C-alpha cells in the first residue's frame, strides 16, 4: 500500500539536466462552432487620389 | 432574433407620452450588440 504522490526535490544546485522546467501545452481544436480566434493582422499605408 | 446562431440584437430609445397601449408614429431601430452565441432558446422571461 503506497501512498501515489510524491515530491519534486527543487534546489538550485541540481544539474542542469534535472532542473525543472515550466511547461506551457497549446491544445489546438477546431470544432464547428464560430471561428474567432485568429492570427495578428497588418495595416498598411492609405493612399489617394 | 437568432440569425445562423448569431443573436442580432437592435435597440431604439425615445421619449414618448402614453397614457396606455401604443401610440400612433413610426420609429426605426437602431443596431445595438451582436452576440456570436449559437444557443438554442425555445422560451424566455422579463425581470422587474
Known sequence: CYFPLQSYGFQPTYGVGY???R???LSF???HAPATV????KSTNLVKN | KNIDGY???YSKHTPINLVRGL???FSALEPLVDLPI???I???QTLH
Open chain 1, 29 to 31: 481544436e477546431l470544432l
Open chain 2, 23 to 25: 401610440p400612433q408614429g
Open chain 1, 19 to 21: 532542473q525543472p522546467y
Open chain 1, 23 to 25: 511547461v506551457v501545452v
Open chain 1, 38 to 41: 485568429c492570427g495578428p493582422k
Open chain 2, 42 to 44: 425555445t422560451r424566455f
Open chain 2, 38 to 40: 449559437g444557443i438554442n
Open chain 2, 7 to 9: 443573436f442580432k440584437i
